[PDB]
Amino acid sequence: DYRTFKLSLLTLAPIHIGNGEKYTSREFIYENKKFYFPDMGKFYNKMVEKRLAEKFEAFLIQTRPNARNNRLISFLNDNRIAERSFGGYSISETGLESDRNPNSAGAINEVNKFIRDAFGNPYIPGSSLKGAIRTILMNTTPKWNNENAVNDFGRFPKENKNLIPWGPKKGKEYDDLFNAIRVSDSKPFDNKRLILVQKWDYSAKTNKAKPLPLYRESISPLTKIEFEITTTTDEAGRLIEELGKRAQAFYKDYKAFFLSEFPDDKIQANLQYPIYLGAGSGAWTKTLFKQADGILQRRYSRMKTKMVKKGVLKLTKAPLKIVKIPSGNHSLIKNHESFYEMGKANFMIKEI
Amino acid sequence: MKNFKISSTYRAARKQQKTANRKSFYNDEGYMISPSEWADGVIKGLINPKNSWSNDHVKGYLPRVSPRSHWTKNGYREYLGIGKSRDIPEKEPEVIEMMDLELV
Amino acid sequence: MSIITDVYAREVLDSRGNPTLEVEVYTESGAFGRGMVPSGASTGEHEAVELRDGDKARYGGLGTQKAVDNVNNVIAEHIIGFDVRDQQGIDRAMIALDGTPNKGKLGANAILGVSIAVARAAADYLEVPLYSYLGGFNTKVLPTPMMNIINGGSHSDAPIAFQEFMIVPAGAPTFKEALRWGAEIFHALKKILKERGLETAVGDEGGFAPRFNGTEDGVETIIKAIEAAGYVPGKDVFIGLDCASSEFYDAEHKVYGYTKFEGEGAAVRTAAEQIDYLEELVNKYPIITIEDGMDENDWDGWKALTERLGGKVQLVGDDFFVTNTAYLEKGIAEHAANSILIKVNQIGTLTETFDAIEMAKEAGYTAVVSHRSGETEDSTIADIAVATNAGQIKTGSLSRTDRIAKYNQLLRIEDQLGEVAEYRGLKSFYNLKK
Ligand SMILES: [Mg+2]
């Protein structure tokens, strides 16, 4: 009836799955080589028993802080508070979390939040993994990755959402392939496995990494997560049982199309079946790049941030880690500047 | 940028490929606009004249940037990006994990 | 300073009124090189293929905007950043970028234009002459010219089957005197044709195409002009032929049909009969070179002609070899011909042109750097002929600046060389006995 697969995911690079929220600069304190993210409710509760509600209001209502009235540690030190225990959680200081320094004026004015459930713990939603799997399957099938995937019957090209049949059709047997692939979500994997990586862009035309002011909360490298993929039909069962050897083919196409133009010391190596999860990995990892080439570039031709040729490579900075695999000692990256390929992960799928 | 400078070869390439004669102009939202509306917006203050234009593109994968030099106390030349720096690298993070079924 | 900084192609016209392209290369220090491409052919099984638009509304389908776009958007992005003196590396990179044996993707015209422009820009950067850059310090030999004077076949309505007739002033002491002798013979023949009532309007090479009775009549008029100028035929000035027998060869019947051009009274010859006719012509007249005496595929006939006449008469393979290293090597192995005609756009780059010239020299063959029907004001082939010390050139008649430009450049090279310049004449036919 149903075939249940276990997908073990090992992140080889930081993975960020946001929820639209952002820690502003007045929600975390950088001290003791750590980032403390206090709960503002408990913060207010213990500064109403200490009678500093009004100046906190003046600190947060304030619209244009100049350089230093924008940081919570400045408020904590100005009013002489040393009682830093109001719920929350701490992120250990990476080192490589940001250019400049985390002190001073610019530093980190915004931190993109990771997706968290109602209890405050992080998790990877099943719809993110399902979107990655759907991109892998659609990009490795000649009946889906062809010229019929674009809808030129309109003002601008757009994806043919009805190329893969879905939904109920009148007087017809159910023909929904992706209702059968039921990818579940993870379990809360604790707040100790998060870091504060920053987005860098590596241009092949310029040949140097350019940092950008876009800081994220991402899962640390070498994180083991487990997903359950329940399948009901034989077609989707064959597709999911071929998810490995399809991920390899998709990555081979991606490497021969995009990653080959960049220095081999930035591109990571694979231990298991490749996959790209979360934000910041790139547009080609989320598109049928065989068809989307030319259209996606033209979308950005009249903007200031012009997409030149096939674009830049997204290379975040996170500490180098070496895995003692039973073949030797495999370093995660091939460069000494600590450049991970943001959004990368590996997986192994079994049929438990 | 103080550790680096614009390379002479890239400057020459930009010079007689004449990329500065084919500037593109953008408004405050970064949308391409004609020079007339760019001038209009800059005059009325709705566009920042500094960060609102581009010098076309230089063809040929040339390196845009060279290292910048300075003088040491000996009176010798030295690259600005080399020196005492700091000393904090540890060794690595060996995470064992001698069970992962590595695909061939 | 020698880093290639800008590469730019533009569409110009050739000497026939047909489009071609020219490529300008600028390096960082300001060195400049301009390479102009002669008009070639877009067809051929084993020759380099030029790129043409095919739009009949523009220039009758002979526009070169596609090759210009290939240079400006493809080749320039790959060559900019190279060293201008890295000519072999640039040519190899362009050949690999094309990815096809016949260079049909980018176009052979584009590749040759970038090659010539890079070589000229490197010579400008080094402040050396082009021949010194191309061939080194030991460049001294001024080539013996084979000046087209009378043409027939497909270039004339006269009953003459041979395509071209040339004068070779190999007895001259210097190249300057050889050029003067050829100009004087050209004007003497013009006077003779005016006296005889024939047409004196030039064709594409600058040579007359008058209504003679036959090949023999043309050769006697040539000798009459040589003696009218005041030079001894067979000692001072020799005669060369370009039969182009691949045009009137019945491939199926394996017969050389002279009836295609010489009327119905002409004879139909076999390979052995063709060799007999060529030997009779060589015995009657002071003929020193014969080009395309057999079909481009008649390998045994080429062999037999080389065994019969190759000891005393230079035999040039134009369609036989089409500037191809493979065909030239096969001909060397089979003892077919003793000379090769080197057309730079038939192969596509200067590197492989010099490779073919070097292989032909190592085989004992002579290399004849040649023009095309549609030429330009560019005179790089003169610098190629001096640089390789080939000792023979074929750059047309004495009548148009698409032809006169190369002769003027050879005059400039001889003047610059001074006392080192050597004009060998008959000694430049090292493929012949004694
Ligand atoms: Mg010929």
From Swiss-Prot, chain A:
CRISPR (clustered regularly interspaced short palindromic repeat) is an adaptive immune system that provides protection against mobile genetic elements (viruses, transposable elements and conjugative plasmids). CRISPR clusters contain spacers, sequences complementary to antecedent mobile elements, and target invading nucleic acids. CRISPR clusters are transcribed and processed into CRISPR RNA (crRNA). Csm functions as a non-specific ssDNase. Base-pairing between crRNA and target RNA to form a ternary Csm complex activates a ssDNase activity; target RNA cleavage suppresses the ssDNase, a temporal control that prevents uncontrolled DNA degradation. Viral RNA transcripts probably tether the Csm complex to the viral genome, recruiting Cas10 ssDNA activity which is able to degrade DNA in the transcription bubble, spatially controlling the DNase activity. Part of the Csm effector complex that includes at least Cas10(1), Csm2(3), Csm3(5), Csm4(1), Csm5(1) and mature crRNA. The Csm complex is elongated and slightly twisted with a maximal length of 215 Angstroms and a diameter of 75-80 Angstroms. It has been modeled to have a central protein filamant of Csm3 subunits along which the dsRNA helix of paired crRNA and target RNA binds. The filament is capped at one end by Cas10 and Csm4 and at the other end by Csm5; ssDNA is thought to bind to the N-terminal HD domain of Cas10. Keywords: Antiviral defense, RNA-binding. The lineage of its organism: Bacteria, Bacillati, Bacillota, Bacilli, Lactobacillales. This is CRISPR system Cms protein Csm5. PANTHER family: CRISPR SYSTEM CMS PROTEIN CSM5. GO terms for molecular function: RNA binding. Encoded in a type III-A CRISPR locus. Belongs to the CRISPR-associated Csm5 family. One of its GO terms (biological process) is defense response to virus.
Swiss-Prot record, chain C:
Its main location: cytoplasm. (2R)-2-phosphoglycerate binds at residues 163, 343, 372-373, 394. It comes from the Bacteria. Pathway: Carbohydrate degradation; glycolysis; pyruvate from D-glyceraldehyde 3-phosphate: step 4/5. Its cofactor is Mg(2+). GO terms for cellular component: cell surface; extracellular region; peptidoglycan-based cell wall; phosphopyruvate hydratase complex. Keywords: Cytoplasm, Glycolysis, Lyase, Magnesium, Metal-binding, Secreted. InterPro entries: Enolase, Enolase-like_C_sf, Enolase-like_N, Enolase_C, Enolase_CS, Enolase_N. The active site is at 205 (proton donor), 343 (proton acceptor). It catalyses: (2R)-2-phosphoglycerate = phosphoenolpyruvate + H2O. Gene3D superfamilies: Enolase-like C-terminal domain, Enolase-like, N-terminal domain. It is an enzyme of class 4 (lyase). Binds a second Mg(2+) ion via substrate during catalysis. Catalyzes the reversible conversion of 2-phosphoglycerate (2-PG) into phosphoenolpyruvate (PEP). It is essential for the degradation of carbohydrates via glycolysis. This is Enolase. It comes from Streptococcus thermophilus (strain ATCC BAA-491 / LMD-9). The gene is eno.
